[PDB]
Structures are given as C-alpha cells and as structure tokens.
Amino acid sequence: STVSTDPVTLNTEKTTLDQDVVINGDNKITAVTIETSDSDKDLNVTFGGHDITATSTVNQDFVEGVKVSGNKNVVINATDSTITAQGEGTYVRTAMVIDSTGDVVVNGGNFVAKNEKGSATGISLEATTGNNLTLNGTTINAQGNKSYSNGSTAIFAQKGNLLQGFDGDATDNITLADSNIINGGIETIVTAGNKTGIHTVNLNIKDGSVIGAANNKQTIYASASAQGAGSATQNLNLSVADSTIYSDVLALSESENSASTTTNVNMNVARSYWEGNAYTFNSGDKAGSDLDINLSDSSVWKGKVSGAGDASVSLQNGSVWNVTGSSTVDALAVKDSTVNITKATVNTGTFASQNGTLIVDASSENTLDISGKASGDLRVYSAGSLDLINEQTAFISTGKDSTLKATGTTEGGLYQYDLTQGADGNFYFVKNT
Ligand SMILES: [Ca+2]
Ligand SMILES: [Cl-]
Ligand code: NA
C-alpha cells in the first residue's frame, strides 16, 4: 500500500522504506525509527524517495519525523524525500533526532520542522558521547515561533540540560557539503551545571553550501554555561569553504557562582561569502568568550563585530571585510586584503598590514582607530567628494610604537588631497595645492 499511517522501523532486516509514512494525532509521534545496533557492519538505509510526516497537537510531548538509535554507523539515502515534523505544541518538533552513538551520513533529503506555538528543530544531535554527522546535498527548513530567539534551529547540538548538567567531554563533527539551510540557525551549546562539561563542535560548511538568504539571516549560536563547582568549555571550529553564509555568529558564556565558562569560536572562511555579525557576550565574573576570524582565498565578509569578549580578525589573499557598523576587536591583520570602512568605524587594539588596503569615505567620520601598535604598509582610497575634505579628521589613528606607513590620495571639490601623517602620528587628508 502506498501510505503507512503507522510508524515504521528500519534496521538490518529492513533497510528500505517502501511507502510514504503519514502519522497524525494528539500524542507523541516518532514516524520512522532507524535502529542500527544489530548491524554487523554499518547500516545503509534508503528512503526510496518516500516522504515521512509526523503531525501532532500534543502539547507536552515530542513530535519526531525520524529517530536514529543504536551504536553502529548508518548512511541514510534520503534523495527526493521530505521528512516533516509539525503541529502546534509547546514541546519541540524535530524532523530528525539522532541519539545513535555511531556515525550518520545523510545523502540528500529535505528536513522540515514547523511549530507555530513552540520550537522547531531540523536535526538534533543527542548521543551522550557526540556524533559525526555528514549532510551531502541536504536541505533543512526549521520554522518555530519567532517570538522565541531560539525558536527555529536547523541543527541543534546541545550537551547537558538545566535538570542535569553535562559531565564529561564530547565532540560533534558536523559537515554540510553542498547543503542548504533554508531556515533555522545552528546551536552548539554545553550546559554543565555543577559538572565539568566540555563540548567541541567541528562545523564544516563546504562545497557550495548555503545558510539563509539576504533577507533571511540566521544565527550560529555557541554557548557555555556552568555554576558553582562546575566548569564549561564550548569550542566551535567553524570552517567555511566555497560557500555562502547569511548568519550572525554569537559566542555566549554564562557563569554563575564563579564557575569558569569559556566559549571559543575559531572561524576560517575560504573562497566564501559571509554576511552577518559576530558578537561575544560574557555573563558573570569568570565567563570568557573569544572569536578568532580568519578570511582567506578571496573571501568577503559583510558585517560587524562587537562585544566584551576577545575578538581577532585576519584577512589574506585578496579578502574583503566590508564593515557595516561600529566594530571593536583586539587585533586586526591585513595581508594583500581590503577593509572597507566607508560606512563605519573600526576600533582595534593592534593592527598589522602587509600590502593592505583601506577604503574610507573621506567625506564621513568613519575611521580606523588603533589604540595600540600599528605596523606595516597600507594604501588608503576614497571616492571623490563634491565637497572639500575635513583635514582634521584622523582617518587612521594609531597608538604607540606604531610604525605603520600609510599613503593615499583622494579628490574633494576641485582639489587633490594626500594622506599625511601628522605630528600626533595619526593620518589626515591634506589639501595638495
Ligand atoms: Ca549584516
Ligand atoms: Cl547539575
Ligand atoms: Na537499503
């Protein structure tokens, strides 16, 4: 028969889904369960193009499209299949839940989660010890209540919870290869409570992947929390290659009763476009957070970075940082690359430039403010202005032991202006007559 209205189990004895699955009700649902544990080697499962839909109005229980359990590796062949978890309820609707301790490779598939009342999550990684998850050509579309900041999560990777802190260490290796997150963010979180919780996520976004859209920016959210004797470390190693990301990146660290909590975000962006803002946020005396942002191989970043945590930005290989709002970092390094500050001021502690380029708007007051040591060589450009340039605007300010060499020319009214170092060490555009 074409459609099962009963839940289906796939396992070593039945690796093929052979009908659509459509479950409706007012109770908990798991429409399809993949049990890997009796597989002698890996398990290879095919959905045969069939769709899977779980819809429930249950308020305080879970709605799941697919659940993957057991302890063997599985490959899920989901090409042309749509896996849906939906229906209005307080508890989260999740298109696919993974508590298997084995690897999970997903080939294709469209994972959809909808919940207008509570949260919706595309894929949740819930193995106690962490999972390897690979998405090849997969699509995720999570739409919860937008009244909630965390309401729509494409990929949810949390260790621990409020009831029981997470005691131990876990690594989730998450790869998006030519995959598309249409809606929902990515959350990589450890809630240690009073335990010692250590969570490392290696998030690889590669080979033509897309997150969000210009008018639909998502959030990549990394968070660590702990209390008292507890301790929490959240590492997010975010590698982006040949891809397009419309997403903020948040590092949040939340400590109570002097528990040490650290959120370390390490971003490498290669041949990619990233549109979105980076933030650090520390709550509590012993909370620390950091952002290490490196653009290489002709990458473009359009966004801003701020927060009370530590942030470092490095650009190489003709990369561009197009600054969209006031930004503050500890350190900015530019090699054969461009920072465009036509629209906003960058504040940095240190600055190092090697064949670097600064784009300014000579008619604005958007400047490069370096509080500490600036070094190297920088070319400064501005489009011509119909109006004269303010010769008292320090378009580059430096701190001490600064050895930066900065040059450039622009046009203001009928005059040429030359970037000139003043007696104060800062750089100003000076009318050349
Ligand atoms: Ca932006
Ligand atoms: Cl606890
Ligand atoms: Na099969």
Author numbering: 40 to 472
How does the study describe this entry?
Autotransporters (ATs) are the largest group of outer membrane and secreted proteins in bacteria and play important roles in virulence, including promoting adhesion. UpaB is an AT that mediates UPEC adherence to extracellular matrix (ECM) proteins and enhances UPEC colonisation of the urinary tract. UpaB is composed of an N-terminal signal sequence (residues 1–37), an α-domain (residues 38–500) and a β-domain (residues 501–776). Here we determine the structure of UpaB at high resolution and reveal that it adopts a unique architecture potentially comprising two distinct binding sites.
The αUpaB crystal structure was solved to 1.9 Å resolution (crystallographic Rfactor of 17.5%; Rfree 21.8%). The structure was solved from a xenon derivative by single isomorphous replacement with anomalous scattering. The crystal structure of αUpaB exhibited a right-handed three-stranded β-helix consisting of 13 turns, with each triangular turn containing three faces, F1, F2 and F3 faces. The interior of the β-helix is packed mostly by long stacks of aliphatic residues, whereas the exterior is largely acidic in nature. At the C-terminus of the β-helix, αUpaB forms a two-stranded β-sandwich that is capped by a three-stranded β-meander motif. However, the most striking feature of the αUpaB β-helix is the extended β-strands within turns 6–10, which reach up to 32 Å in length. The β-strand extensions contributed by turns 6–10 and the long loops protruding between turns 2–6 form a long hydrophilic groove 11 Å wide and 12.5 Å deep on the F1 face of αUpaB. Indeed, we identified electron density associated with the αUpaB lysine pair likely to be a bound calcium. Similar to other lyases, this calcium ion would be held in place by the neighbouring αUpaB Glu 314 and Asn 316 residues. Substitution of residues D116, D119, N146, N175, D217, K245, D246, D281, R310 and D336 on the F2 face to alanine (αUpaB_S1) caused almost complete loss of FN binding as determined by ELISA, while maintaining the correct secondary structure of αUpaB_S1 based on circular dichroism spectroscopic analysis and displaying a behaviour in solution similar that of the native protein. This result mapped the FN-binding site to a ladder of charged/polar residues that are contributed from β-strands or loops in consecutive rungs of the αUpaB β-helix.
